[PDB]
Amino acid sequence: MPTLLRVYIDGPHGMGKTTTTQLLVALGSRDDIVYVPEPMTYWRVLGASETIANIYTTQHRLDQGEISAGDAAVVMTSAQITMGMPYAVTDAVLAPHIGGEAGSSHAPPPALTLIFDRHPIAALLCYPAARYLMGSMTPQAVLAFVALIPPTLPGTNIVLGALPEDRHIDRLAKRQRPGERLDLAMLAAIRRVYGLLANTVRYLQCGGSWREDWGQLSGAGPRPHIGDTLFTLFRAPELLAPNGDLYNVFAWALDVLAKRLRSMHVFILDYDQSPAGCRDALLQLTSGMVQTHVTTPGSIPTICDLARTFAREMGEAN
Amino acid sequence: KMPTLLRVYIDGPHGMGKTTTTQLLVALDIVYVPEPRVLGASETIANIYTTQHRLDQGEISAGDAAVVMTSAQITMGMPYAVTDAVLAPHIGGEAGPPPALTLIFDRHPIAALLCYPAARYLMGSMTPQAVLAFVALIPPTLPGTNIVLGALPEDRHIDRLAKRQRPGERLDLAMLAAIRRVYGLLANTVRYLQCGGSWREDWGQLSGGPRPHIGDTLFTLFRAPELLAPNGDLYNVFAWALDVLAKRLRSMHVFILDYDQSPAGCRDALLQLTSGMVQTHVTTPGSIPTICDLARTFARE
Numbered sequence: 001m002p003t004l005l006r007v008y009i010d011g012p013h014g015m016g017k018t019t020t021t022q023l024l025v026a027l028g029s030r031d032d033i034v035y036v037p038e039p040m041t042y043w044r045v046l047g048a049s050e051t052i053a054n055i056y057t058t059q060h061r062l063d064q065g066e067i068s069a070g071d072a073a074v075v076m077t078s079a080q081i082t083m084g085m086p087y088a089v090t091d092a093v094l095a096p097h098i099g100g101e102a103g104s105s106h107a108p109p110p111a112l113t114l115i116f117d118r119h120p121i122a123a124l125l126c127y128p129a130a131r132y133l134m135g136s137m138t139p140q141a142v143l144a145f146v147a148l149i150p151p152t153l154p155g156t157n158i159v160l161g162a163l164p165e166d167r168h169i170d171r172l173a174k175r176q177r178p179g180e181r182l183d184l185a186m187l188a189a190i191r192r193v194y195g196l197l198a199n200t201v202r203y204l205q206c207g208g209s210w211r212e213d214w215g216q217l218s219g220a221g222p223r224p225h226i227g228d229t230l231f232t233l234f235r236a237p238e239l240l241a242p243n244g245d246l247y248n249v250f251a252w253a254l255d256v257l258a259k260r261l262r263s264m265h266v267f268i269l270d271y272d273q274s275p276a277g278c279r280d281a282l283l284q285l286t287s288g289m290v291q292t293h294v295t296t297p298g299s300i301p302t303i304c305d306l307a308r309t310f311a312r313e314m315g316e317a318n
Numbered sequence: 319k320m321p322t323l324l325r326v327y328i329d330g331p332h333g334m335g336k337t338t339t340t341q342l343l344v345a346l347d348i349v350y351v352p353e354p355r356v357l358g359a360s361e362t363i364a365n366i367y368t369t370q371h372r373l374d375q376g377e378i379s380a381g382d383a384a385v386v387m388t389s390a391q392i393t394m395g396m397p398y399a400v401t402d403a404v405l406a407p408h409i410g411g412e413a414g415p416p417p418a419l420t421l422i423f424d425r426h427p428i429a430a431l432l433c434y435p436a437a438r439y440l441m442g443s444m445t446p447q448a449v450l451a452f453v454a455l456i457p458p459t460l461p462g463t464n465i466v467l468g469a470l471p472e473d474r475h476i477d478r479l480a481k482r483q484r485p486g487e488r489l490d491l492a493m494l495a496a497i498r499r500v501y502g503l504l505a506n507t508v509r510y511l512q513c514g515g516s517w518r519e520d521w522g523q524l525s526g527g528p529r530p531h532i533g534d535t536l537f538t539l540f541r542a543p544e545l546l547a548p549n550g551d552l553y554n555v556f557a558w559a560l561d562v563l564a565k566r567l568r569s570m571h572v573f574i575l576d577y578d579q580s581p582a583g584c585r586d587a588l589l590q591l592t593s594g595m596v597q598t599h600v601t602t603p604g605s606i607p608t609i610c611d612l613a614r615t616f617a618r619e
């Protein structure tokens with residue numbers, strides 16, 4: 001009955017997302033805005049040892065032809081499960097607290113705002129999809145992940161980043177992070193997937209039916225072409241039955257994708273500015289966003305305790 | 319009122335007579351959603367059994383086995399996970415007239431997302447962190463989730479596994495004991511939770527009304543040192559995964575099928591078990607039509 005605003009800031013790495021969310025949270029209150037960070041200590045210590053290094057080394061060895069596609073795929077798939085775990089778990093313990101649409105739009109101020117560094121679909125859809133484009137994951141495994149994306153509840157606000165390629169390359173080339181290797185092909189792949197993601201949500205919200213438009217696959221705003229959405233990635237010989245039809249297991253995975261993305265509220269944040277500019281731009285975007293009621297009166301303190309515990313335990317140390 | 323649905327998941331360890339029994343019962347408003355290789359996967363089952371063998375011989379490391387088992391389990395789970403995800407919107411609340419439709423499933427998503435991963439953990443070929451990642455991905459347990467688990471003396475179970483060719487499989491008695499133990503602990507866990515058990519309250523009992531001892535549930539598996547801080551406490555991320563486990567399993571209705579009899583008796587036993595199973599309503603008048611459409615299309619492949 002108190003209201004909740006949830007805001008997931010996501011998109012390609014290297015844009016300044018992590019900075020922007022911290023600056024926003026810093027704008028004060030503490031008792032009514034909390035940050036759920038990238039679970040770096042999960043990735044690097046708790047779930048497995050140095051998963052980030054494992055990911056970039058695995059692609060490097062593939063690129064150098066030191067390991068096969070199949071061997072790259074099993075390492076990448078398994079690493080991506082480690083990557084997604086904290087997100088999946090958080091979403092699962094949060095879900096029963098989330099009630100109906102409240103409004104924000106002409107509604108009062110949230111009793112609590114949670115700013116997430118990334119949504120579950122980052123590790124369950126977007127990075128797996130980019131790794132597919134990089135030759136280190138199979139499309140079957142990507143759809144296996146899709147089938148496991150948790151139900152999208154009301155008030156799922158996703159903020160995705162925009163940045164010119166040239167500035168983004170520059171931002172990545174300056175960035176130094178344990179185990180990451182500078183890979184401009186992966187950059188291109190991940191930028192593309194998140195572009196497709198934005199288009200997919202618009203497509204679905206404009207009443208798009210991927211089954212209606214499937215034959216059109218070949219090679220804010222108006223309705224996008226299915227070829228500009230994520231559906232375009234899954235018209236691949238490995239998934240096609242002896243008749244050009246998608247095997248039913250795969251077509252159902254795409255139905256799930258549509259059911260998971262359609263309910264999302266997407267916003268685009270311009271990262272081509274100062275850290276404080278990015279913060280205030282984000283601030284403006286939030287005022288209009290969809291809030292929800294929570295399901296119990298003790299829901300707010302519990303959610304707050306969850307977020308702070310998560311941050312302390314899995315947020316970057318040292 | 320919307321028509322009623324009965325969902326029945328035939329699960330438990332492989333090699334007990336699952337498929338035979340189900341095929342027999344169906345051969346008589348009743349539809350079988352059978353086992354999915356599935357859609358052209360490079361025999362995952364072969365790689366699973368080969369990997370464990372290579373591990374047991376010291377040909378590959380624990381870590382190497384772990385990446386294969388984790389990737390493999392994702393592949394094995396997909397058919398069940400996708401089936402569950404598309405059916406879910408059609409499932410309404412608990413009802414209690416005969417069901418307009420009975421769906422018999424070959425397995426529940428927990429087999430690939432919990433039970434087999436946990437058995438591989440016991441076999442040293444999966445990390446407990448990966449097992450808890452699969453747990454975190456178990457779909458919310460819907461109303462009327464009836465799961466049938468098998469009872470079979472181990473020696474007869476061994477005979478049954480040996481009775482028929484299984485391409486890619488190796489008869490592994492340690493794995494057989496592991497999957498049997500896991501399913502045994504699954505049944506005890508459901509009873510523990512239905513009896514009001516709180517793993518957080520009982521956790522201290524692993525270090526030394528009526529319900530199973532926590533030591534006889536799935537919770538005992540997760541006292542794994544990989545999951546613990548230097549002071550012995552479970553990390554919150556893993557503890558939250560266990561809260562999730564509790565919420566996934568408590569709602570399930572478990573029925574035990576004695577497989578230690580003739581195929582006819584097994585069929586009959588299974589039918590006997592349905593009288594106590596929980597039915598639900600569907601959500602739309604068109605639901606039954608589309609579910610039968612979804613089960614038919616699933617059947618072709």
Ligand SMILES: Cc1cn([C@H]2C[C@H](O)[C@@H](COP(=O)(O)OP(=O)(O)OP(=O)(O)OP(=O)(O)OP(=O)(O)OC[C@H]3O[C@@H](n4cnc5c(N)ncnc54)[C@H](O)[C@@H]3O)O2)c(=O)[nH]c1=O
Pocket residue numbers: 331332333334335336337338339353363366391394395425429430431434435478479481482484487577579580581582584
């Ligand atoms: C889901 C999952 C599976 N697996 C592994 C386990 C398996 O090794 C393999 C396939 O797993 P499956 O569950 O899809 O199917 P299967 O293991 O092939 O076998 P099932 O368990 O589906 O059925 P059964 O093996 O019981 O099938 P059935 O052929 O009926 O029984 C075996 C033999 O017993 C006889 N039989 C059947 N009923 C009998 C009875 N009442 N009395 C005496 N004999 C009986 C039959 O004639 C047959 O010879 O993959 C994983 O590693 N990870 C996973 O997540």
Ligand SMILES: Cc1cn([C@H]2C[C@H](O)[C@@H](CO)O2)c(=O)[nH]c1=O
Pocket residue numbers: 013038052055080083084118122123124127128180
């Ligand atoms: C969330 C996520 C991040 N990453 C990478 C890209 C960035 O280099 C780093 C994010 O901090 O980890 C993945 O490879 N997979 C994922 O699922």
